[PDB]
Amino acid sequence: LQDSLDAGVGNLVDADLAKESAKLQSLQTKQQLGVQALSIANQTPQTILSLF
Amino acid sequence: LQDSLDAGVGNLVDADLAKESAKLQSLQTKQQLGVQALSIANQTPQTILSLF
């Protein structure tokens, strides 16, 4: 019964790490893509300076 | 919400400078033409001296 209760605790709280590896690599790509998009959005306003 | 309020203040007060460049160049040309027209208007009266 104690082994069953420990297995139930593990079923209740434990994460599935094998899916987390793919989620981690995808988020690591997404964060750099977001940094690049933010850099381009920062660059965008300054083109007005060429008009003067 | 703070970002939305900042965007609304910018929508309210901010100028569109890309039109301002054209307005500035046209206003400079208009100022030069106005100085020329004022110069001719100053010159006009003094032709009376040829009659005497």
Curated annotation (Swiss-Prot), chains A, B:
Q: Where in the cell is it found?
A: Secreted; Bacterial flagellum
Family of this protein:
Belongs to the bacterial flagellin family.
The entry describes its oligomerization and partners as:
In C.crescentus, the flagellar filament is composed of multiple flagellins of 29 kDa; 27 kDa and 25 kDa.
What does the UniProt function comment say about this protein? Flagellin is the subunit protein which polymerizes to form the filaments of bacterial flagella.
Any idea what this protein is called?
Flagellin FljL
Taxonomy-wise, where does this protein's organism fall, top ranks first? Bacteria, Pseudomonadati, Pseudomonadota, Alphaproteobacteria, Caulobacterales
| Chain's gene name | fljL
Q: Which residues of the full protein are shown?
A: 220 to 271 of 273
